[PDB]
Amino acid sequence: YVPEDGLTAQQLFASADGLTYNDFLILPGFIDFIADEVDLTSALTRKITLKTPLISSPMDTVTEADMAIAMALMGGIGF
Amino acid sequence: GGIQTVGHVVKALALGASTVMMGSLLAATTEAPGEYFFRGMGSLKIAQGVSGSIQDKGSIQKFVPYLIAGIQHGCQDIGARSLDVLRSMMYSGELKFEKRTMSAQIEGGVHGLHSYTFLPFT
Amino acid sequence: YVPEDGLTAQQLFASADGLTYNDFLILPGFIDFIADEVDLTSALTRKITLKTPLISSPMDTVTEADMAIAMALMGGIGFIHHNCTPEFQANEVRKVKKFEQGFITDPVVLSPSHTVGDVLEAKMRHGFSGIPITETGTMGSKLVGIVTSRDIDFDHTTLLSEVMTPRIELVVAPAGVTLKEANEILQRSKKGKLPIVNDCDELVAIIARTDLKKNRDYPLASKDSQKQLLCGAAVGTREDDKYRLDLLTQAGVDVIVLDSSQGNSVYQIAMVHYIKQKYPHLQVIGGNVVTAAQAKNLIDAGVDGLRVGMGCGSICITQEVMACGRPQGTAVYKVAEYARRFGVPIIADGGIQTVGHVVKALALGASTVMMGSLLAATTEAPGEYFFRGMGSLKIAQGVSGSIQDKGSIQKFVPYLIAGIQHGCQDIGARSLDVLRSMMYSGELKFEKRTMSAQIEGGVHGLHSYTFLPFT
Amino acid sequence: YVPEDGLTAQQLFASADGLTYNDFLILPGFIDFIADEVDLTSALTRKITLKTPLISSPMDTVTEADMAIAMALMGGIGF
Ligand SMILES: NC(=O)c1ccc[n+]([C@@H]2O[C@H](COP(=O)([O-])OP(=O)(O)OC[C@H]3O[C@@H](n4cnc5c(N)ncnc54)[C@H](O)[C@@H]3O)[C@@H](O)[C@H]2O)c1
Ligand SMILES: Nc1nc2c(ncn2[C@@H]2O[C@H](COP(=O)(O)OP(=O)(O)OP(=O)(O)O)[C@@H](O)[C@H]2O)c(=O)[nH]1
Ligand SMILES: Nc1nc2c(ncn2[C@@H]2O[C@H](COP(=O)(O)OP(=O)(O)OP(=O)(O)O)[C@@H](O)[C@H]2O)c(=O)[nH]1
Ligand SMILES: Nc1ncnc2c1ncn2[C@@H]1O[C@H](COP(=O)(O)OP(=O)(O)OP(=O)(O)O)[C@@H](O)[C@H]1O
Ligand SMILES: O=c1[nH]cnc2c1ncn2[C@@H]1O[C@H](COP(=O)(O)O)[C@@H](O)[C@H]1O
Ligand SMILES: O=c1[nH]cnc2c1ncn2[C@@H]1O[C@H](COP(=O)(O)O)[C@@H](O)[C@H]1O
Secondary structure: OOOOOOOOHHHHHHOOOOOOHHHOOOOOOOOOOOHHHOOOOEEEEOOEEEOOOOEEOOEOOEOOHHHHHHHHOOOOEEO | OOOOOHHHHHHHHHOOOOOEEEOHHHOOOOOOOOOOOOOOOOOOOOOOOOOOOOOOOOOHHHHHHHHHHHHHHHHHOOOOOEHHHHHHHHHHOOOEEEEOOHHHHOOOOOOOOOOOEOOOOO | OOOOOOEEHHHHHHOOOOOOHHHEEEOOOOOOOOHHHOEOOEEEEOOEEEOOOEEEOOEOOEOOHHHHHHHHOOOOEEEEOOOOOHHHHHHHHHHHHOOOOOOEOOOOOEOOOOEHHHHHHHHHHOOOOOEEEEOOOOOOOEEEEEEOHHHOOOOOOOEHHHOOEEOOOOOOEEOOOOHHHHHHHHHHHOOOEOOEEOOOOEEEEEOEHHHHHHHHHOOOOOEOOOOOEOOEEEEOOOOOHHHHHHHHHHHOOOEEEEOOOOOOEHHHHHHHHHHHHHOOOOEEEEEEEOOHHHHHHHHHHOOOEEEEOOOOOOOOOHHHHOOEOOOHHHHHHHHHHHHOOOOOOEEEEOOOOOHHHHHHHHHOOOOEEEEOHHHOOOOOOOOOOOOOOOOOOOOOOOOEOOOOOOOOHHHHHHHHHHHHHHHHHOOOOOEHHHHHHHHHHOOOEEEEOOHHHHOOOOOOOOOOOOOOOOO | OOOOOOEEHHHHHHOOOOOOHHHEEEOOOOEOOOHHHOEOOEEEEOOEEEOOOEEEOOEOOEOOHHHHHHHHOOOOEEO
């Protein structure tokens, strides 16, 4: 038996202090697989599944046609 | 002091007490001093005790085996192979407690019945 | 805009203080429906759905055959206690299953050479009086006639051939016809019995007017695909329980519950594995668990249901004989919030004293509620009156009590249903499933009830009084 | 994975509210042994080990010679 350490997400966010990404960490676990085996298939909407989570934001300094092509080729999607 | 039942004996053994010393639980028995009908040692300059009476409970040689079996079953229901393992479990944090408010205390011999008898095998 | 009041279930139970049913309340909501509209269809195990959540606990002072019948008729289910000979338990389950039948596939029959005394003897022995008659005195023979009570309203030495209604007169339906058409020809016939014979004129099975009359009378009964009452039985975890279970399944049990003070043990898990190997079609309900850790390994073993609660029974002295236990409200909440992910329903047993406790238990995630003392003194309960925990006697786990008698189940349970319906209607839940979804999403909110708020039930402002529930 | 339930002894007694035996419970665990297998050997003092924890209190209404004998015979000790 080994005691549990750290806060669940629910416990962490219950305090209502306004956390951001730079304000908490995830404690490690157990490794029994090569890194490349991880699968990133993610769902964009309820009928589109992307093989990677990456998306490019719709802005006039990013996501041209030539970037939407080059980001759809790599598994993501561009707006 | 305070030991009234096997539950209290095991609770005291769980909290770190190596042994448990009994008073009233053994006061009325075939081996206890005096005689029957049908006392705190400071009970009499000031009264530290009281003079009581108890229902008689047979003999120690027939009553203590029940008190041992109750302890064994109480630890077996917890998963401790011995008292030392039970106290080690309490110390390491493996054995966990729950608080018992009054409305959870009344859930022992609940008063749903009109009358009853106990008959412990003793 | 109106501010939110009260604590969600999660907020109420996060403090970890050990709440019970008498230690909190549910704040009301909005009413836009008549009480009778509420729907109580509850799930016993993963393949049994009961039209009411009431269960009778397996004990030697409750759940006879005559109470399992009278509680299955009213929509619930009853578990036959296992403090009896295995043949006795099998007989109890047989009598539970042979109350209403549909196709009576094993009717007792006689040959024409028998005697009116024999027919009367069989009547006194079982209860059925419409004895079919076949040439060989068995199912595999020509149907020659039938003898019923109306034929014997009287001499006892006369043979059945002199009292039978012959086959030339009988109105019979050809075998292989669906149940509906069989009932149609029975009802146009205006006669009590409709034997069923095949194209070879050989008796196959019979149906009775009284079975469909019982269906008409009891709309909420619980039945299987053969239209015969649903029965459950309890069994221990010793070795002899294997032969016990063999006998039980011979009787025709539908659901079996493992009986143990603490469920989480290698012996219970071995029984679960044996059951799910020998009888894959039988639903097994796990033992008494009060924690997620206890529930997990029973779920893995493959219990189709879970019994939650330990130490809180009315007749239970476990909390005093040993130090283990957990308050009923916290126990039911915290094993029913975990079980829900795997679909195994929960049966919160013990501590139920009132309709308020029944509804409180069903609000906290318990799919069904199992009752003890509430049903112990009734016309259908075992024993006799004047004017007992199953471990009450090496050590006393129970107590022998007495209760004030409460009439019959068939007149007591409708009030118990109406109370639940009104309690949910006052909250605004169209059904128990909606109530538990409300509890889970956070819409249904609770309030704590200190002692000075508990004393505000039947307050002691009165000198004396009477209750008179319509029952 | 299954979440932990209940309070450790340290957590239970940290509040400093004055608990007694009738004020808390012990949650159950796992059973893989017959009850009789449990061993109760307990230590009275640093050089006396009793095969059972039971002791009889020293009082004038208990622990005669005839009870000290009958309690030492059963594994305990009497004062
Ligand atoms: N409210 C409660 O939680 C509660 C508490 C105590 C008793 N009860 C009731 O009392 C009745 C019996 O309780 P019980 O605890 O005596 O049940 P039980 O005797 O069937 O099981 C308890 C004991 O049986 C032993 N056991 C089980 N299978 C075994 C096997 N194969 N080999 C060896 N030992 C084995 C266990 O180790 C344990 O000591 C039941 O009706 C039960 O529900 C209920
Ligand atoms: N002979 C016989 N027929 C039955 C029995 N129970 C139901 N039936 C028939 O099976 C059909 C059941 O459909 P309904 O009567 O519409 O519905 P119900 O009463 O809810 O039926 P259950 O779901 O069995 O309660 C009808 O034809 C009934 O007459 C029974 O015990 N015996
Ligand atoms: N009212 C009434 N019911 C009858 C009569 N004869 C038989 N029955 C009922 O027919 C019903 C049919 O259901 P079952 O009990 O399953 O019938 P069975 O399986 O043939 O026989 P038993 O188990 O012996 O009762 C029985 O419950 C009997 O009570 C009779 O003369 N009058
Ligand atoms: N299929 C059938 N066709 C014709 N007559 C039948 C048939 N089955 C039974 N009978 C006869 O009809 C008469 C009454 O049958 P029924 O089944 O209504 O009696 P019962 O229900 O046993 O009597 P009770 O009036 O006590 O309820 C008897 O003479 C019986 O033998
Ligand atoms: O006279 C007395 N006054 C106060 N405490 C006493 C007296 N005599 C014995 N005790 C203590 O009280 C205990 C008995 O309590 P019991 O276990 O509940 O019966 C023992 O722990 C004693 O040492
Ligand atoms: O003999 C016993 N000792 C301890 N608990 C029992 C015993 N018999 C039945 N029980 C349980 O106690 C309950 C009955 O409590 P009630 O609902 O308050 O009457 C059911 O949940 C049972 O399974």
